[PDB]
């Protein structure tokens, strides 16, 4: 009964998240294909994704529970197809800004993917359900990264054909959503829900902040003329590390009623100490291992939060609660980026940035580690 919805949902997730063209976006757009300058791509195109994402997250989390979810997953599929068609055949700066608007729609509509399954499945399959859905996306990301690396180097695959492969992947994914079963017909009062959302809001803002500077840190630490190959490979392995960590959450029989918070504290410290290790250590392998632990550890927690939010939601407000938490994370991340990295703010170099990111994650652990009064 639960197998068919889960199978179709994870097939859609795998085929949508498998996109070879993603790691070569900047080389593609600034390359000989589109000829967009670095200043343009960085300041006029890319920001439209953040504002489009921020604005579109509002209707998504406002309505996704009303429309019963499937309409939102289908909309995400169509947005995927439009985005990649424009990427393939769209030339100019305004066209790329529209591409970024539709990608903001695509990512903002992802709340329905994780929200959808708890409406069609019984509460007793929520743990297993949560693990597969997160892992297939990360397994798909790793597979796409490996395929792109092999093709671009071994197959001399041009970025246009990576884009074509990703377009075919998202088209197949769109075809998989038409068959998804349709579900049928101030909520933070619970403290588990409140704290799981608090960690989601703040940890998520920090996580997406690191990802844009890991490769910059690795280059500064160990200047290597072939860093690009190693930077991609470690990203993929770190992404595969969280796929099995996410998968292992749904399989292992552990009483999550008592291990909910305990896991939050233990892996919150591993997210802090892992970041200090990349900042302080001189070996790049120690820095590579730090990223693997940080990304794998975070994805272990993001799986428990979604599972542990859905369990304590009395009302079927899955997209509201998930949608708010990824929106407040967007606000936090955008504010923090301005303070820390932006020239308008402090303009910290990557040398010290991870002491900020490292301690920023220690503060998160500090709040959760100190909730025991006697």
């Amino acid at each position, epitope marked *: 009964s639960w197998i068919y919805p889960t199978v179709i949902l994870c097939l859609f997730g795998f085929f949508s998240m498998m996109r070879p063209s993603e790691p070569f976006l900047i080389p593609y757009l*600034s390359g000989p294909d589109k*000829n967009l300058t670095s200043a343009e791509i960085t300041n006029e195109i890319f920001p439209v994704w953040t504002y489009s994402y921020l604005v579109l997250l509002l209707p998504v989390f406002v309505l996704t529970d009303y429309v019963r979810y499937k309409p939102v997953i289908i909309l995400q599929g169509i947005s995927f197809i439009i985005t990649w068609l424009l990427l393939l055949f769209g030339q100019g700066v305004k066209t790329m800004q529209v591409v970024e608007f539709f990608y903001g729609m695509v990512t903002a509509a992802e709340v329905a993917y994780y929200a959808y399954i708890y409406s069609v499945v019984s509460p007793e399959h929520y743990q297993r359900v949560s693990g597969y859905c997160r892992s297939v996306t990360l397994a798909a990301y790793t597979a796409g990264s490996v395929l792109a690396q092999l093709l671009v180097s071994l197959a001399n695959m041009s970025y246009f054909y990576l884009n074509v492969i990703s377009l075919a992947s998202v088209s197949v994914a769109f075809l998989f959503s038409l068959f998804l079963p349709m579900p049928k017909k101030e909520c933070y009062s619970s403290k588990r829900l409140f704290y799981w959302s608090l960690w989601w809001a703040f940890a998520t803002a920090g996580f997406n902040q690191v990802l844009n500077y890991v490769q910059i840190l690795w280059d500064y630490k160990a200047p290597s003329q072939d860093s690009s190959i190693y930077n991609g490979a470690v990203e993929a392995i770190a992404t595969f590390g969280g796929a099995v960590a996410a998968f292992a959450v749904g399989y292992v029989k552990v009483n999550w009623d008592l291990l909910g918070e305990l896991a939050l504290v233990v892996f919150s410290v591993v997210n802090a100490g892992s970041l200090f290790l990349m900042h302080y250590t001189a070996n790049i392998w120690a820095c590579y291992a730090g990223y693997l632990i940080f990304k794998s550890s975070y994805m272990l927690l993001i799986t428990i939060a979604v599972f542990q939010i859905a369990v304590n939601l009395n009302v079927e407000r899955y997209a509201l609660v998930f949608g708010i938490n990824t929106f407040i994370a967007l606000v936090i991340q955008t504010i923090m980026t301005v303070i820390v990295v932006d020239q308008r703010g402090l303009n910290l*170099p990557v040398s010290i940035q991870f002491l900020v990111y490292g301690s920023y994650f220690a503060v998160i652990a500090g709040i959760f580690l100190m909730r025991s009064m006697y």
Partner: nanobody
Amino acid sequence: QVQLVESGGGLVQAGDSLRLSCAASGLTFSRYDMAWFRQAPGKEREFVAAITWTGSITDYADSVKGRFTISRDNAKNTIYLQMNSLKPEDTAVYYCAAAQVPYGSTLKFNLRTLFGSWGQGTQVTVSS
């Protein structure tokens, strides 16, 4: 306003060598991929070299390769270009350019579309 100042150019008989310097200012020099371009008298500006911000990589044009040694001195916010065995076909106005985005190399921005913030160039007249 990123300000760059090319110095070093001048007449040099063929076979001698030169060193130009470009003491960049107004930017965080230790984060930007600097470069050197030239504009021969009757053509368009053409990439010559580009030293990544880490300094571990130095791309070069096919013609110059093997004679040009781009460098950088982050202490002095300066970059150099040693030009050895100069042939009359190297004559140009040598402009130093700064990456319009700090970590261009790490984010994999095409080099020949990554450098702006031009200077006012220095004249090299390789006189056979």
